[PDB]
């Protein structure tokens, strides 16, 4: 049972470490979408202003 301490740690540590990566990836996608949409709205404001 003592020899399972490393086993019991690997049952938690590496899985959480991997999950952190997808947690970061989803935020990365959200950031990319937010910045792209901001640029796409700013361009349509600028075009409107200059056309006026």
């Amino acid at each position: 049972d003592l020899d399972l301490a490393k086993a019991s740690a690997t049952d938690q540590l590496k899985k959480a470490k991997a999950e952190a990566q997808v947690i970061i990836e989803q935020a990365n996608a959200a950031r990319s979408q937010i910045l792209d949409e901001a640029k796409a709205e700013a361009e349509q404001e600028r075009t409107k202003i200059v056309a006026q």
């Binding site: 404001e45 600028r46 202003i49 200059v50």
Partner: protein, 52 residues
């Protein structure tokens, strides 16, 4: 966008200055053509020879 608009306005103003200058000097040419005087020409000659 606002800077672009202001720059276009300044360019338009300079354009109008360029427009007016050419036809203004071209009209001044005709003013000379139809207001010249031989006494004025002699005055010009005597003025420039008096300061050569």
């Amino acid at each position: 966008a606002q800077a672009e608009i202001e720059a276009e306005r300044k360019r338009a103003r300079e354009e109008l200055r360029k427009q007016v200058a050419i036809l203004a000097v071209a009209g001044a040419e005709k003013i000379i053509e139809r207001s010249v005087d031989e006494a004025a020409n002699s005055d010009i000659v005597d003025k420039l020879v008096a300061e050569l």
